[PDB]
Design an enzyme around this catalytic site. Structure first.
Site, PDB file in Angstrom:
ATOM      1  N   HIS A   1       0.808  -1.224   0.000  1.00 56.48           N
ATOM      2  CA  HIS A   1       0.000   0.000   0.000  1.00 56.48           C
ATOM      3  C   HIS A   1       0.845   1.281   0.000  1.00 56.48           C
ATOM      4  O   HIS A   1       0.315   2.381   0.030  1.00 56.48           O
ATOM      5  CB  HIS A   1      -1.051   0.000   1.142  1.00 56.48           C
ATOM      6  CG  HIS A   1      -0.506   0.325   2.504  1.00 56.48           C
ATOM      7  ND1 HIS A   1      -0.679  -0.510   3.588  1.00 56.48           N
ATOM      8  CD2 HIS A   1       0.166   1.404   2.971  1.00 56.48           C
ATOM      9  CE1 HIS A   1      -0.123   0.032   4.660  1.00 56.48           C
ATOM     10  NE2 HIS A   1       0.398   1.194   4.312  1.00 56.48           N
TER      11      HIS A   1
ATOM     12  N   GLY B   1       2.789   5.923  10.107  1.00 57.55           N
ATOM     13  CA  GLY B   1       4.164   5.781   9.682  1.00 57.55           C
ATOM     14  C   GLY B   1       4.832   4.589  10.306  1.00 57.55           C
ATOM     15  O   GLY B   1       6.022   4.445  10.190  1.00 57.55           O
TER      16      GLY B   1
ATOM     17  N   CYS C   1       3.604   1.454   9.697  1.00 56.59           N
ATOM     18  CA  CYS C   1       3.432   0.379   8.719  1.00 56.59           C
ATOM     19  C   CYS C   1       4.789  -0.126   8.273  1.00 56.59           C
ATOM     20  O   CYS C   1       5.712   0.679   8.040  1.00 56.59           O
ATOM     21  CB  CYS C   1       2.642   0.864   7.519  1.00 56.59           C
ATOM     22  SG  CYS C   1       0.941   1.364   7.935  1.00 56.59           S
TER      23      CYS C   1
END
Lengths: 306, 5, 306, 5
Positions: C41, C143, C145
């Site tokens: 993503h 942030g 991820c």
């Protein structure tokens, strides 16, 4: 979102863990540049631990009485001195993994990360608080002595704790990296007991502010309180007296959530008298005191879930 | 008693 | 003595954290040898996150659409492929800090350590459990991820989790290192909700055995129970059905403490119906389910405080 | 709604 007991990444500290054997006692040491720090009681046998005189015991030792091992590789000792409750062993190599660092003595209520270690080999990391009674509720077995506690700011490791011993209650005692004990504890086996502890008010309040930052406010009320009326209640419940210093430390958090410190105190006062009524705060059924205001700023959003 | 670990 | 949420030393994992920017989205990646793994993503804008087609979105990208940074130093991308929900970016360098390692998909109830990371920079470590509903109650901001979860056995890092997203309840969802989600969750922004959770019976029992190993037995009783009578009670209280497999896993612990599994079950049954009566177990007012039987063996004494 | 972080 979420809120957990978070420790600092332990990598910079792992690179400094070594093993120290003297005679028959093995424990962990701390290798910074060309020095290795460890608990002095490494020079003691079972008999010695009651009633040791470290001056007398240490003078019976040479450089080669000490064996220090970094991973597989033997490091040779070329100098030794005693400093309060630690030994400082000069070695033949300077640690290539030495990070920037500092030695700080921390204050009660403050938190730090602990790298639990056995035979110079790191086995786990956890976060804890230096209690008011100068103990920590850690988790240590035999052979964890010389395991260290630390804070990391930017790139620089702040060493604040070295482990020396365990007390009858099952909590832990040790030293700063000058070798001076936290607490009235000594380097030997006698009747020693933790003094009575207290709950850490400043931190409970910090943690309430986090609950709000993360979007919860059920426990708030319409009341306010004076510092002194709050203290009369704090004493009944075995909480630390709250001070103006603590109220000023809570300023940034008060500002981010728009709740005044003394309003949060009335919130807490009410929590203490009425209970939590079967509810949770940040997933907990009790009032949590092992997060400082700093820990809340680091971990939480800078933006409130309004 | 205490215990040095 | 003592018993804490202990994570694994994070050093071996810190050496593999990098930053990945694509267009305007920055997140964390995992650098093993000459590959960097991250959430796919990363190739999405705000508009894209609802209703993405990753095939179509990815084919609009070259090797140099991706920017990867290891500390200060830029790493060049020279190959890319998609694997389920991750990207695999081939780079020009092989990580000199690559430890021995494995990719394992973990099972519900199992625990692991999480290295929370921002802009390819490690910021904290905590221990958690993969819940029955395939979420984790972690702590992540925007942030995080591409931050990873792992177990360390001996010298070998077992990667089991990569972070992708957060759910409305405030708990977290992500993937194993093949890029396959834990749970029925998908790589996009829709109405997604955690299914109803359950308490992890096997672990509660493990933790009771630790309480005994560490010297506490107040909660024991004289009764015994059948597995099936225990389950009828487990269901009322939203506990997982206990199975014979779980009873066999508890063998070593049963043997070290001399308490039979089904006797501990009656202990627990009684705890569920009668409450803890204002008392603690291993310092807690509630029944703890985030320690596996393995976590208890690792952390506790091999010798019971009889 | 959910949020990809």
């Amino acid at each position: 979102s979420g809120f957990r007991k978070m420790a600092f990444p332990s990598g910079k500290v792992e690179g400094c863990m070594v093993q120290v054997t003297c005679g028959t006692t093995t424990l962990n040491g701390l290798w910074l540049d060309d020095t290795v720090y460890c608990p002095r009681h490494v020079i003691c046998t079972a008999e010695d631990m009651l009633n040791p005189n470290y001056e007398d015991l240490l003078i019976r030792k040479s450089n080669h009485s000490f064996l220090v091992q970094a991973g597989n590789v033997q490091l040779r000792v070329i100098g030794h001195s005693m400093q309060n409750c630690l030994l400082r062993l000069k070695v033949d190599t300077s640690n290539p993994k030495t990070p920037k660092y500092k030695f700080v003595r921390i204050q009660p209520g403050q938190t730090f990360s602990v790298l639990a270690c056995y035979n110079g080999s790191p086995s786990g990391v956890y976060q804890c608080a230096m209690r008011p009674n100068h103990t920590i509720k850690g988790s240590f077995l035999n052979g964890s002595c010389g395991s260290v506690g630390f804070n990391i700011d930017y790139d620089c490791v702040s060493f604040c704790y070295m482990h020396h011993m365990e007390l009858p209650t099952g909590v832990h005692a040790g030293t700063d990296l000058e070798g001076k004990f936290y607490g009235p504890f000594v380097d030997r086996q006698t009747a020693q007991a933790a003094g009575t502890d207290t709950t850490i008010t400043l931190n409970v309040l910090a943690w309430l502010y986090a609950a709000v930052i993360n979007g919860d406010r059920w426990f708030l009320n319409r009341f306010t309180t004076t510092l002194n009326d709050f203290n009369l209640v704090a004493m009944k419940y075995n909480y630390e007296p709250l001070t103006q210093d603590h109220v000023d430390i809570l300023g940034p958090l008060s500002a981010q959530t728009g709740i005044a410190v003394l309003d949060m105190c009335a919130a807490l006062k009410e929590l203490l008298q009425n209970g939590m009524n079967g509810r949770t705060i940040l997933g907990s059924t009790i009032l949590e005191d092992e997060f400082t205001p700093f820990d809340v700023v680091r971990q939480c959003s800078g933006v409130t879930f309004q | 008693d205490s215990f040095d670990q």
